[PDB]
Amino acid sequence: EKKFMRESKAIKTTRVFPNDLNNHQTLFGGKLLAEIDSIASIAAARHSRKHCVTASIDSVDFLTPIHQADSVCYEAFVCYTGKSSMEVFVKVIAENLLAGERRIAATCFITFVAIKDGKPSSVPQVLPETQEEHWLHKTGLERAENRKKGRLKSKEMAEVLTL
Amino acid sequence: KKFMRESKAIKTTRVFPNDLNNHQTLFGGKLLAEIDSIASIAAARHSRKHCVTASIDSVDFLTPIHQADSVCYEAFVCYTGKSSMEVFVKVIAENLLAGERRIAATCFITFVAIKDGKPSSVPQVLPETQEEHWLHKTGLERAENRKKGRLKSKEMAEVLTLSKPWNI
Amino acid sequence: EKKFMRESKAIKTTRVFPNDLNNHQTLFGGKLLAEIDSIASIAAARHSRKHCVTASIDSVDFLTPIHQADSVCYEAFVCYTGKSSMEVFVKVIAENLLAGERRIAATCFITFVAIKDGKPSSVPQVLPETQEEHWLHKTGLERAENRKKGRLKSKEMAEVLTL
Amino acid sequence: EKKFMRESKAIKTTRVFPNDLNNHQTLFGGKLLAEIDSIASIAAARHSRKHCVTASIDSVDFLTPIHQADSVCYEAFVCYTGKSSMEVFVKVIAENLLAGERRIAATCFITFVAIKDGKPSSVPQVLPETQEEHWLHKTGLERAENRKKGRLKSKEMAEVLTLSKPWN
Amino acid sequence: EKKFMRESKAIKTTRVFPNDLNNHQTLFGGKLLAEIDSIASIAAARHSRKHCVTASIDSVDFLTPIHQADSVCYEAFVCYTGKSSMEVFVKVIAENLLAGERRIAATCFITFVAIKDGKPSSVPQVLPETQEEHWLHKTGLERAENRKKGRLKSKEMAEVLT
Amino acid sequence: EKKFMRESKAIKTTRVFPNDLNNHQTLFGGKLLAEIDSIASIAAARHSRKHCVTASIDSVDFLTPIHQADSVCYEAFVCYTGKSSMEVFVKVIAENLLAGERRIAATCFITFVAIKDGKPSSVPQVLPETQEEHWLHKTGLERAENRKKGRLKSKEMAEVLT
Numbered sequence: 009e010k011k012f013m014r015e016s017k018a019i020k021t022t023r024v025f026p027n028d029l030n031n032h033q034t035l036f037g038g039k040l041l042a043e044i045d046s047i048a049s050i051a052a053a054r055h056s057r058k059h060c061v062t063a064s065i066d067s068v069d070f071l072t073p074i075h076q077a078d079s080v081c082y083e084a085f086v087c088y089t090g091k092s093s094m095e096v097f098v099k100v101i102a103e104n105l106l107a108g109e110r111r112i113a114a115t116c117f118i119t120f121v122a123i124k125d126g127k128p129s130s131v132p133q134v135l136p137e138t139q140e141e142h143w144l145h146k147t148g149l150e151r152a153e154n155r156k157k158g159r160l161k162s163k164e165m166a167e168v169l170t171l
Numbered sequence: 172k173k174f175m176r177e178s179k180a181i182k183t184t185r186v187f188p189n190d191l192n193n194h195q196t197l198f199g200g201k202l203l204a205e206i207d208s209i210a211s212i213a214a215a216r217h218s219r220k221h222c223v224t225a226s227i228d229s230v231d232f233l234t235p236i237h238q239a240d241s242v243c244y245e246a247f248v249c250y251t252g253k254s255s256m257e258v259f260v261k262v263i264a265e266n267l268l269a270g271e272r273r274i275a276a277t278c279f280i281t282f283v284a285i286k287d288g289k290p291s292s293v294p295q296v297l298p299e300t301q302e303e304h305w306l307h308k309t310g311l312e313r314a315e316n317r318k319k320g321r322l323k324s325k326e327m328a329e330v331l332t333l334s335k336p337w338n339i
Numbered sequence: 340e341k342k343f344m345r346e347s348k349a350i351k352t353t354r355v356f357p358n359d360l361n362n363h364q365t366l367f368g369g370k371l372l373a374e375i376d377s378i379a380s381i382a383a384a385r386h387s388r389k390h391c392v393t394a395s396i397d398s399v400d401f402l403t404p405i406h407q408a409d410s411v412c413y414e415a416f417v418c419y420t421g422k423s424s425m426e427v428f429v430k431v432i433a434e435n436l437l438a439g440e441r442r443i444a445a446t447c448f449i450t451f452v453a454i455k456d457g458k459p460s461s462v463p464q465v466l467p468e469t470q471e472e473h474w475l476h477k478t479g480l481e482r483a484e485n486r487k488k489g490r491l492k493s494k495e496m497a498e499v500l501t502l
Numbered sequence: 503e504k505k506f507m508r509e510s511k512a513i514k515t516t517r518v519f520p521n522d523l524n525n526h527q528t529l530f531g532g533k534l535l536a537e538i539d540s541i542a543s544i545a546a547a548r549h550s551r552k553h554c555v556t557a558s559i560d561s562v563d564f565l566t567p568i569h570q571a572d573s574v575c576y577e578a579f580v581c582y583t584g585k586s587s588m589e590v591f592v593k594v595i596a597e598n599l600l601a602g603e604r605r606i607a608a609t610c611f612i613t614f615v616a617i618k619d620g621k622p623s624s625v626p627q628v629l630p631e632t633q634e635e636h637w638l639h640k641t642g643l644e645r646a647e648n649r650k651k652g653r654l655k656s657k658e659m660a661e662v663l664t665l666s667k668p669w670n
Numbered sequence: 671e672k673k674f675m676r677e678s679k680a681i682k683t684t685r686v687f688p689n690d691l692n693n694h695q696t697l698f699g700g701k702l703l704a705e706i707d708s709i710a711s712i713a714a715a716r717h718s719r720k721h722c723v724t725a726s727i728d729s730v731d732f733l734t735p736i737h738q739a740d741s742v743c744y745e746a747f748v749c750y751t752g753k754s755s756m757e758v759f760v761k762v763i764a765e766n767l768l769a770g771e772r773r774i775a776a777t778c779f780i781t782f783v784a785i786k787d788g789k790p791s792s793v794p795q796v797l798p799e800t801q802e803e804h805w806l807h808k809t810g811l812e813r814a815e816n817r818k819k820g821r822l823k824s825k826e827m828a829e830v831l832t
Numbered sequence: 833e834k835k836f837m838r839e840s841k842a843i844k845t846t847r848v849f850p851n852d853l854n855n856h857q858t859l860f861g862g863k864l865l866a867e868i869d870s871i872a873s874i875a876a877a878r879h880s881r882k883h884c885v886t887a888s889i890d891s892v893d894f895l896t897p898i899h900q901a902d903s904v905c906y907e908a909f910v911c912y913t914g915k916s917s918m919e920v921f922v923k924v925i926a927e928n929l930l931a932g933e934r935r936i937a938a939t940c941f942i943t944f945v946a947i948k949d950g951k952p953s954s955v956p957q958v959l960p961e962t963q964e965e966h967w968l969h970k971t972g973l974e975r976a977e978n979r980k981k982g983r984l985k986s987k988e989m990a991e992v993l994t
């Protein structure tokens with residue numbers, strides 16, 4: 009079965025809470041990364057319609073500092089698939105509420121996997137229908153490959169560290 | 172002019188039902204959140220200044236953590252620039268009933284000291300032990316490797332901000 | 340000095356957390372009511388681009404029990420505007436992450452007030468564009484009026500209660 | 503058997519926590535409504551034993567602002583009873599801890615339904631004792647009708663959005 | 671500059687939340703302690719009308735396990751003073767909402783110190799009214815004495831541990 | 833069978849979050865007690881290899897205020913035992929991140945009890961290895977005895993109350 013990339017899209021608009029602020033009253037990278045895993049998993053659920061799990065998150069670069077005045081929106085769709093794997097694109101936009109002026113804060117490639125009876129299950133492939141969607145699709149296979157290599161470099165480090 | 176031990180930080184914790192998902196397994200988000208949290212302490216101890224998370228290298232979720240396990244986060248500064256700091260964070264899981272332990276993940280995560288408004292000078296780290304040396308070899312390599320990631324991520328910002336047609 | 344309703348839309352898609360669950364493993368009304376106030380204030384900030392404050396919430400009727408299996412999406416726009424008030428229409432949909440059977444769990448009128456230098460500050464008027472949006476505006480004044488009445492029944496009660 | 507209203511009374515007094523303050527440093531409405539559902543559910547629980555569910559909540563008017571320097575008290579008890587329904591009354595007092603000046607911040611009627619086997623269940627009737635327990639028990643049956651009419655619009659609006667039934 | 675105990679009484683009834691449950695589906699001891707501190711902190715404020723801090727907690731003995739379906743009532747009041755210190759009694763009662771049968775889960779003497787402008791500040795004296803209130807007042811002096819001592823052992827242990 | 837103390841060692845270093853502060857920008861005592869219970873519950877499990885429950889906490893003397901700038905290290909390990917019970921020692925040390933001027937904020941003896949199928953359950957013996965470890969181990973007996981008294985005092989106060 010097949011599924012449009014818009015059929016698994018999830019948005020989360022929210023205020024910045026002051027507990028989640030730091031030494032200079034800026035949002036902790038961690039809370040951003042927490043919001044990205046949660047919105048990203050919803051997309052992954054909508055698309056595969058089965059119980060998923062976070063396997064990897066690609067590198068994330070924090071472009072701009074977020075404040076107590078700012079709002080923060082997390083847009084998330086599925087833009088690639090293997091058999092059980094989903095690559096979810098997530099864009100993080102920070103709107104200053106009073107000033108009104110938006111700015112891009114982080115973008116993230118994050119990788120969800122469907123699981124059934126403890127074993128990974130099949131997921132429908134996603135098909136793009138937008139310039140941005142198309143470019144993501146085209147470029148996606150390259151990343152999925154750079155990731156298989158990355159996964160092995162992580163597993164090696166788990167074993168070196170052991171001994 | 173400072174040692175990696177001088178910024179070491181350990182947080183050992185319990186897993187809380189609210190961070191379990193539908194399969195009763197810890198969320199990735201919870202883990203990334205604590206990797207940022209401890210890392211931020213490490214970078215603080217070291218720099219002796221207030222820092223901010225510049226970037227977090229990719230992280231691979233090697234194992235599922237359960238309700239009956241405990242998670243240990245170990246982290247220290249292992250590389251330095253002039254305001255930057257490569258923090259290395261190691262995530263050990265351990266069944267509390269059984270003695271079985273496993274590495275759940277590793278993460279390089281980059282903090283930037285800020286004195287007033289903009290980045291400030293942060294001391295250079297000298298490895299002491301064997302494993303502290305082995306993590307200094309790749310320091311210069313990943314630093315560049317990342318320097319290329321930021322610009323890529325910064326260009327994609329502009330494609331979305333300025334609306335540049337995708338191929339640039 | 341004017342603004343379309345859609346300029347104040349704000350959505351929050353989220354999962355149900357087991358701590359916000361009760362003895363039947365059902366979502367508490369309060370987490371729903373808390374979420375509604377949260378999403379609605381962003382809507383109220385986007386619109387007035389000023390510091391708003393929650394003055395009242397109309398009755399909510401909880402139509403359907405939300406489960407650990409479901410997501411809950413919260414849509415929120417300003418439908419009516421006073422001198423410094425603003426009615427925010429808030430729709431609460433709840434779909435089963437797997438099955439995919441969507442349903443509306445609650446709907447809520449909720450009244451925010453712009454505030455500056457500690458005293459109520461002016462807001463734009465708001466203009467509908469859709470069938471549903473037009474019915475909101477049109478029926479809006481009837482509601483604004485019942486609130487000026489209910490607020491007196493409320494103030495009077497506080498006074499009796501001191502006794 | 504029928505209970506006597508003060509057999510299901512519940513008080514929660516509490517601090518105000520910086521995370522639940524506004525842009526203005528005043529308490530959010532949502533926190534208050536969440537606390538009101540919380541206490542009410544205990545009252546509703548004590549009265550009828552069993553296990554209840556929030557059917558609906560009458561409008562709430564936020565009479566006062568609440569500040570980081572204050573304390574808030576939630577007092578709640580069943581006042582009306584239908585067959586399975588329970589009307590909980592909730593009084594919300596704010597107090598400056600350093601002043602000792604107390605105000606009413608809000609009141610709320612909030613209906614609760616007992617559920618024994620995934621379907622509704624037989625709640626005991628509530629007898630009032632004091633004058634206050636008289637003064638708001640009498641107008642009980644009035645505001646219970648209003649809510650049959652409130653539910654109708656809401657249930658009606660559901661189908662308009664669900665079934666897309668054209669507005670009117 | 672004298673106040674009755676009822677003028678500091680504070681009550682907190684809560685349900686037991688699944689986060690704060692341990693692996694045996696029973697409440698964490700540290701949740702019970704966190705709550706005991708927060709309710710005792712209100713009482714000390716109610717009574718001092720000044721901003722207070724926690725100086726000590728006496729030993730607490732957890733007499734009953736608290737399960738998922740129980741309520742928990744915290745009842746705190748000031749029960750003995752000195753110059754800048756206030757000593758709050760906290761009785762914690764756990765009620766099974768279905769069975770309706772209560773039990774005492776713990777009681778706690780917790781000490782707060784009123785503090786104005788970086789240094790401890792003056793506090794009203796307390797006046798008992800009931801038998802219970804009178805009982806806890808007379809016995810205050812003796813409790814105050816042991817605190818003064820254990821404090822020394824605690825500051826001793828802090829010098830020697832480093 | 834029996835384990836060394838360092839086989840139950842648990843460490844928790846942590847930020848001081850602004851929600852856990854009071855009006856004076858200082859850490860709530862009850863948060864410290866919450867953190868202390870949680871890190872000691874790991875030490876207990878690590879050593880017991882069974883489901884543990886807090887049975888009591890000794891008095892705790894808060895020697896230092898902890899400001900929002902500070903970090904908090906909690907260090908727990910088991911240091912006396914009986915049949916099903918385990919007494920855990922916890923030292924709390926407060927470091928000013930931007931000056932690193934460490935001080936001990938508190939120290940705590942907290943007693944946990946291993947539990948198997950409703951009832952208390954067998955737990956290994958603890959072996960000291962250092963001065964401190966040897967130190968706390970010898971004094972363990974006296975402390976176990978004084979605890980035994982209070983529990984009766986604590987049960988006494990529970991019968992006598994409502």
Ligand SMILES: CC(C)(COP(=O)(O)OP(=O)(O)OC[C@H]1O[C@@H](n2cnc3c(N)ncnc32)[C@H](O)[C@@H]1OP(=O)(O)O)[C@@H](O)C(=O)NCCC(=O)NCCS
Pocket residue numbers: 061062063064089090091092093119121123128155156159196197198199202231232233234235236
């Ligand atoms: C994800 C996981 C279930 C994979 O199961 P496995 O049997 O070990 O791995 P497999 O080789 O069968 O992987 C199956 C799929 O996962 C994908 N995958 C697994 N690990 C991945 C990683 N680190 N990065 C990207 N894709 C990954 C594979 O590419 C493959 O995709 P496919 O459907 O196209 O074949 C396993 O890695 C796991 O459970 N990890 C932790 C899960 C978790 O709990 N998340 C974080 C906990 S905090």
Ligand SMILES: CC(C)(COP(=O)(O)OP(=O)(O)OC[C@H]1O[C@@H](n2cnc3c(N)ncnc32)[C@H](O)[C@@H]1OP(=O)(O)O)[C@@H](O)C(=O)NCCC(=O)NCCS
Pocket residue numbers: 034035036037038040069070071072073074223224225226251252253254255281283289290317318321
């Ligand atoms: C990242 C940031 C520091 C860039 O600062 P800047 O003044 O614009 O740029 P500079 O390149 O001069 O930054 C100085 C250092 O940051 C490093 N840096 C900045 N972004 C980086 C990234 N993504 N990865 C690695 N290093 C990075 C630079 O390499 C440089 O290291 P060096 O000083 O040793 O040479 C600033 O944009 C920032 O930190 N904002 C976001 C921080 C934040 O709030 N993060 C979490 C929010 S959720």
Ligand SMILES: CC(C)(COP(=O)(O)OP(=O)(O)OC[C@H]1O[C@@H](n2cnc3c(N)ncnc32)[C@H](O)[C@@H]1OP(=O)(O)O)[C@@H](O)C(=O)NCCC(=O)NCCS
Pocket residue numbers: 392393394395421422423424450452454459486487490528529530531534563564565566567568
């Ligand atoms: C709303 C508030 C800020 C201003 O009240 P006030 O000083 O009496 O102001 P007014 O009586 O002149 O009313 C000003 C506006 O508030 C609106 N308003 C006030 N209370 C209202 C209520 N209960 N329902 C609906 N509208 C209300 C009025 O309609 C008016 O809007 P408009 O003039 O643009 O038409 C005040 O009622 C308040 O502070 N209450 C809530 C405080 C808060 O923090 N909310 C919840 C905390 S938990």
Ligand SMILES: CC(C)(COP(=O)(O)OP(=O)(O)OC[C@H]1O[C@@H](n2cnc3c(N)ncnc32)[C@H](O)[C@@H]1OP(=O)(O)O)[C@@H](O)C(=O)NCCC(=O)NCCS
Pocket residue numbers: 365366367368369371399400401402403404405555556557558583584585586587613615622649650653
């Ligand atoms: C409450 C609920 C069980 C009603 O069940 P139902 O079979 O649909 O309806 P019934 O007519 O049998 O309702 C039974 C009682 O609920 C009362 N009731 C139901 N909805 C009500 C509402 N919105 N306001 C007031 N009373 C209401 C009825 O008056 C009736 O009282 P009675 O027993 O004395 O006659 C159902 O509406 C429900 O479960 N919804 C809320 C559940 C929930 O989880 N809420 C909060 C989640 S965020």
Ligand SMILES: CC(C)(COP(=O)(O)OP(=O)(O)OC[C@H]1O[C@@H](n2cnc3c(N)ncnc32)[C@H](O)[C@@H]1OP(=O)(O)O)[C@@H](O)C(=O)NCCC(=O)NCCS
Pocket residue numbers: 723724725726751752753754755756781783790817818821858859860861862864893894895896897898
């Ligand atoms: C408690 C504190 C104010 C002690 O003040 P100090 O100037 O060092 O000592 P003092 O003897 O002057 O204390 C003043 C009063 O408090 C009492 N007191 C102080 N420390 C005490 C302790 N540990 N136990 C009991 N009483 C204590 C003194 O007996 C005295 O009582 P009195 O004046 O009514 O007779 C100070 O040590 C402090 O701030 N402690 C930590 C506060 C805190 O942050 N608590 C929670 C941290 S997690």
Ligand SMILES: CC(C)(COP(=O)(O)OP(=O)(O)OC[C@H]1O[C@@H](n2cnc3c(N)ncnc32)[C@H](O)[C@@H]1OP(=O)(O)O)[C@@H](O)C(=O)NCCC(=O)NCCS
Pocket residue numbers: 696697698699700702731732733734735736885886887888913914915916917943945952979980983
């Ligand atoms: C632990 C508990 C079952 C006591 O056990 P019991 O069935 O009464 O039998 P005992 O009192 O003999 O307990 C057995 C052991 O625990 C020790 N113990 C029990 N209660 C104790 C207390 N209050 N203080 C210290 N030690 C205690 C006994 O000394 C004995 O040690 P030992 O086994 O080496 O001889 C009971 O105190 C309890 O479960 N309390 C609630 C625990 C809890 O939920 N904690 C958090 C509450 S929020």
